[PDB]
Amino acid sequence: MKGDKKVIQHLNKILGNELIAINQYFLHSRMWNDWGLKRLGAHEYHESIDEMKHADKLIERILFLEGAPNLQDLGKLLIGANTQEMLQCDLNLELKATKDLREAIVHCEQVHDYVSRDLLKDILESEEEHIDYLETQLGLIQKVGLENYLQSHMHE
């Protein structure tokens, strides 16, 4: 079905953010597992999988709308050197992603692509849950202390 060219460009931009998130979260997950922080690693792995699922739905929609999904252009991964930085790197990524999602939704609405809008709203709800998770972890580090917070995420 012939889609709006600007919508497709937006969909491809959201896809680009997912592809960053996939790799960033996967690496952070394996870094935490490597350190023995297996509960943090397991949770970060599931964040990664969520983004893989987002990317898949974006790819399917771009192809239905007769555009070309861009999986070639991989933007800058934000890799931290410790748990506190890793969480904040993820949270910086998510905040930038939600800004792009909101702008894409505005454009879908303007050209009446309501099905793409709905897809993007679904992704956005998930990213806001991710933001909640990240803010909540950083807040817990402050309330319980870094050492306790890491202790609590050693064993699954």
46 binds a copy of itself per the rule CB under 8 A: no
Helices 38-64 and 83-110: angle between axes, nearest 10 degrees? 20
Report in angstroms how near the CB of residue 77 gets to a copy of itself at its nearest. 5
**Contact indicator for 64, 1 with CB cutoff of 8 Å:** yes
Q: In three state form, how does the secondary structure of 51-104 look?
A: HHHHHHHHHHHHHHCCCCCCCCCCCCCCCCCCHHHHHHHHHHHHHHHHHHHHHH
Give 55 or 119: the residue with its C-beta nearer to ligand HEM.
Answer: 55
5 binds a copy of itself per the rule CB under 8 A: no
C-alpha atoms less than 13 angstroms from C-alpha of 111 in its C-beta half-sphere: 17
Provide the binding-site residues for a copy of itself, judged by CB under 8 A: 1, 19, 23-24, 26-27, 30-31, 33-37, 56, 59-60, 63-64, 69, 71-72, 74, 76-77, 95, 102, 105-106, 112, 114-115, 118, 121, 124-125, 128, 131-132, 135-137, 139-140, 143-145, 147-152, 154-155
Question: Which parts of this chain interact with Fe ion (CB under 5 A)?
Answer: 18, 51, 54, 94, 107, 118, 122, 127, 130, 135
